Symmetry: C3
Subunit: 278 residues, 3 copies
Amino acid sequence: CLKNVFSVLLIFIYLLLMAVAVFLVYRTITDFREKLKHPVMSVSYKEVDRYDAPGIALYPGQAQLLSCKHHYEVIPPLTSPGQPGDMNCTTQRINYTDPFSNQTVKSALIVQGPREVKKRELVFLQFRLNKSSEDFSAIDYLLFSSFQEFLQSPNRVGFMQACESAYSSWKFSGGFRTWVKMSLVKTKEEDGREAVEFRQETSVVNYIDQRPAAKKSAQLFFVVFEWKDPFIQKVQDIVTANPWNTIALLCGAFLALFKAAEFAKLSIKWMIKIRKRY
Amino acid sequence: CLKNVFSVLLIFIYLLLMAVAVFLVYRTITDFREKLKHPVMSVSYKEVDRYDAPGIALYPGQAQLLSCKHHYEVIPPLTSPGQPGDMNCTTQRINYTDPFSNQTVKSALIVQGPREVKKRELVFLQFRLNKSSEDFSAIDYLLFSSFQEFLQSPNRVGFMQACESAYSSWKFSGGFRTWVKMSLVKTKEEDGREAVEFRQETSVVNYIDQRPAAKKSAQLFFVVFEWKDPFIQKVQDIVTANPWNTIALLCGAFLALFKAAEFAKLSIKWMIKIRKRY
Amino acid sequence: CLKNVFSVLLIFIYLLLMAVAVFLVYRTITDFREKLKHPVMSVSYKEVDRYDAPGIALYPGQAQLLSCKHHYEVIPPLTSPGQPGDMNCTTQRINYTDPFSNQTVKSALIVQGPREVKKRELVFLQFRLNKSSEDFSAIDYLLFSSFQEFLQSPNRVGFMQACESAYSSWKFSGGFRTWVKMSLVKTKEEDGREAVEFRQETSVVNYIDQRPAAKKSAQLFFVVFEWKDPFIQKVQDIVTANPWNTIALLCGAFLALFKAAEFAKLSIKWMIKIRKRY
Ligand SMILES: CC(C)CCC[C@@H](C)[C@H]1CC[C@H]2[C@@H]3CC=C4C[C@@H](O)CC[C@]4(C)[C@H]3CC[C@]12C
Ligand SMILES: CC(C)CCC[C@@H](C)[C@H]1CC[C@H]2[C@@H]3CC=C4C[C@@H](O)CC[C@]4(C)[C@H]3CC[C@]12C
Ligand SMILES: CC(C)CCC[C@@H](C)[C@H]1CC[C@H]2[C@@H]3CC=C4C[C@@H](O)CC[C@]4(C)[C@H]3CC[C@]12C
């Protein structure tokens, strides 16, 4: 009767503790799986006094590089457009076959980019393309981390074929002065290596072709490559769920439930004492 | 005297354990509230072999669509600007009333965008606007996820009025070839639905109008829509704080404090034994 | 013999529990250090009915501000380019010395930017630069949070010298209508103050200079400053590791290990009872 009712109610509350433990374990499994599916990303900005000289692989095609200069000032000085000028950059011409065509072979002009961002160093390039019939004259450029790595790397063709994939390729148009402010984003993945990518913001400024004012009629390309700021953006995903913390938390919960059960036994004893007193 | 001093000191240390428990509970409350206020964002890039044909709602106004083409090559071929050309895209003209004017009715030309990013497929559009007096000629365009969803959706006016809000609208100018490299960002919120948005990077290339070299004097708009890469950016916030883990951790802490109290009792017994030995 | 083997095996399992505790503590140390090194970033978009009037510090140089207007419509109305027009904005001219030159003194024209994003308010500025010989005509502009803060701040020179550092400076070119859609990103760091930065997306539209069609031959700069959307992006790093949670979890683990040890003692007693029964 009453004794049996109390006994079955208390075995029921013990089963309730066991069910709470099982529900906690199931919720832990689900939360661990969800956390594994969705690692959380962290971004840290690491300042560098001077950047490693980037490699700017340009694809002029028929465009003739009139001049290349390294300018430490915030702006390039006045120029003499349309004619060859002094060249003061490090260039390397390489003809590789892009893996995505495998048939067409492209010639690239790798230029050593600016190093000292703190001095606002920039590289100013001027190309000239003779009369053409394309109606849209632009030159492709691809940025990769280090020009020296390219120089001292065997099978430079292999290095370039890796860049045509691991790096994006943009365009700069004629009749502008495409000012490219570039930044480094290094993403760290779980499987070791850290991948470096080039972000770049482009600002086009019209070129005033009133100076020739003659039958020149030849496209002029002006470009400036410069580092946006001394900060490299390190981005890495973090696996918020690790087995050891989960095991420790579940063990603590199980210990708490066990002490709850022994407290229930002590409550049994207390009720027995109260009944005895009556 | 000494007995009373020890007794009050030990009830004090028990109260110290209780105060440590209360401080831990208060810190847990504050941390849980702060974590609820600030869920942490996670980004995952999901690769798709081919994108769902996006809908490009253009607003030419008086501009006449000279031609539309789907080009699988990395570049469009040579054109014949200023004159009507072959049209090889899927277009649908719809006149809806934008909810933000509610009075002005705008006509849109929905074009089926490129699907196969892996083939570097792009859609090249050419419009011609006769002589005008605006001094700034540009055409609005709005990107939405699926053109087929628009086709097979009742009250297409309602669908477009939803896009004039759930999607951004940019411009492309005349005298350029606006190359738009577009990407999909899908943000998952707590309350169910996942919202898709279009990021886009635009590269303007001057159009060489030397080919006409006559009294044509009519604005020409050239646009290229292309997928930047096969990766859709899934972004979702994660509520790092859940009640069950907090309860388990607090229960473990309380169990530890209880065992500390019973260890203090055992220390009482040990001191009593030491005194007895003397 | 067997008794000694069992005794040494069980002191070995006790040492195994101690070693598991030590390994858990070491893993906790490593995880806490890694989490401290890499706080996780959270982004929240806070909607604002109207923005605080931003300050647009322009650097015309010799360019003459033909006109400034506040337009609530989505587009500016028709203009009369090349000639002075009505001015209806709040401007303040200040000549400060940029800390990075310390020798060159720059004159800035601070304009009160648009406030009511919800009305799609924008500020349209027109400058005229007489015949020059630069070949690349552009005007620098720098955005800072509040124009009123600049007005009611002593040593306005100090305020501007702070902006030439805490804010980025972009350019807008002549012959375009640079449409600048700007947004606010507020980053909260551990050491108190919250830093406000201006993101901006720029859309250049060719200016049709056919209206003059004469010997005017003077550069015209057109700019539109407008808020991209009513959402300010709050970004803050979160230190996922706090000492109290780590202590609670480790204490729970230690309690679990202690109960495992006492369960091992109970297993000793159970084996002794079984042997006695035989
Ligand atoms: C093996 C590689 C691919 C990683 C994925 C393995 C994951 C899914 C496994 C490894 C450790 C597991 C945890 C370890 C043990 C337990 C036992 C008990 O506490 C229930 C939950 C809990 C906490 C498990 C959740 C799932 C888990 C996280
Ligand atoms: C109800 C919706 C809006 C979500 C917000 C409810 C939040 C604030 C409540 C629900 C569960 C609560 C927790 C649950 C119970 C306890 C009891 C004891 O452990 C103290 C802290 C702790 C851990 C609380 C912190 C605040 C809490 C997180
Ligand atoms: C002091 C400022 C610079 C912050 C850095 C101090 C960090 C490294 C210290 C402070 C609290 C420490 C924790 C506190 C105490 C313990 C004791 C035991 O549980 C081992 C791990 C654990 C959990 C430590 C991990 C390292 C720790 C996180």
